[PDB]
């Protein structure tokens, strides 16, 4: 899987894009790896924050479905027009699939401007797709169309520019160190998982554990932040403000309202505690735990002309639609999508920053019990 390796590009803050071409002759694009939604959708217009776009007139491959998309955010949205056409990815397995493909053509907070990315590659599955499950996605279409293997893996590093790999099709063992531990995907929609304990630093919260899964638990290559129920972000922010307490901070940064600023050299990482989520194992009772650093959830905020220090975001935040591991928990392991299997697969990161002090980990097995009870219906 050599041709695979490093085929991921971004910015800090605005996710992990892939080369793709779509159509005859092949348009390149770079597209957003989204695990967290089931939609390919592309720009397909000129509009003013995007290098280029796709263009149908051009494309003899090019189908209309006859059939618009509408996606709503909370202050924003995608819409688009519906077909299919040829789809490949240079830095990827050598075939050529027929995709779904969202041409967009009108759009709100979508596209950012100063970015270098065109669309959206959905990974998940079928049932969150739009405008019904029966819009077969990308993934799905290329498993069914070729004979790549049903599981892809992401190992994303980012060190202002980040880099990663999307392995499909395989995982390729140069991108972790020591063993995959595995999850159950508890449900295909998003990559549910089930949360089964947390401690910071060791440290347990000791919340009915089905807190931490209500009512989704999921992992998003998309989400910048690791996002929890209102109730555990609650506990979870009040342990970490305690062995914090060497210094101060206002209440405003713990809510990702202000950004806290030190001087070049003087982050101070290891007043910070460890944040461990025990993940659900593949074996009755039997749990694995993967281990988390500040330097995940204390993300560096990009350019300053207001400032000239080493700036961050709190990336920890709150949700009314479950838990979301984002690029803060990602950057630490690579995982592996293994949809053939119904599992997700946990190692450490090859390009993980550490140094001699703390290292993220992936350990087990434990014991734990009832993690059945875990999970909301």
Sequence with gaps: FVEMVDNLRGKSGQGYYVEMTVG????????????????????????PFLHRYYQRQLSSTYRDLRKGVYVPYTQGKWEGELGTDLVSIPHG?????????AAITESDKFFINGSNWEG????????????????????????????????????????ASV?????????DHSLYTGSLWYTPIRREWYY??????????????????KEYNYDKSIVDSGTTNLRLPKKVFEAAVKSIKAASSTEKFPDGFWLGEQLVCWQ???????????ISLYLMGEVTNQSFRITILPQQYLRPVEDVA?????????????????????????????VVFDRARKRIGFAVSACHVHDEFRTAAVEGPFVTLDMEDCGYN
């Excluded at 397995?93 to 493909?101: D, K």
């Excluded at 304990?197 to 009915?208: A, F, H, S, T, Y």
């Excluded at 070049?264 to 460890?274: E, L, S």
Aim: aromatic share 8%; proline share 6%.
């Design 24 to 47: 005859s002759p092949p348009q390149t694009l770079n597209i957003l790896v989204d695990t967290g939604s089931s939609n390919f959708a592309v720009g397909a217009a000129p509009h």
């Design 93 to 101: 397995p050598n075939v050529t699939v027929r995709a779904n493909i």
């Design 120 to 159: 959206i590659l959905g990974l998940a599955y079928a049932e969150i797709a739009r405008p019904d499950d029966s819009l077969e996605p990308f993934f799905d279409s290329l498993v069914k169309q070729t004979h790549v293997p049903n599981l892809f893996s992401l190992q994303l590093c980012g060190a």
């Design 163 to 171: 880099g990663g790999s999307m392995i499909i099709g395989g995982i």
């Design 192 to 209: 549910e998982v089930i949360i089964v304990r947390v401690e910071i630093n060791g440290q347990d919260l000791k919340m009915d554990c």
């Design 264 to 274: 070049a050299g003087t982050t101070p990482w290891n007043i910070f505690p460890v």
């Design 306 to 334: 207001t400032s000239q220090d080493d700036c961050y975001k709190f990336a920890i935040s709150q949700s009314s639609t479950g838990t979301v591991m984002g690029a803060v928990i990602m950057e630490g392991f690579y």
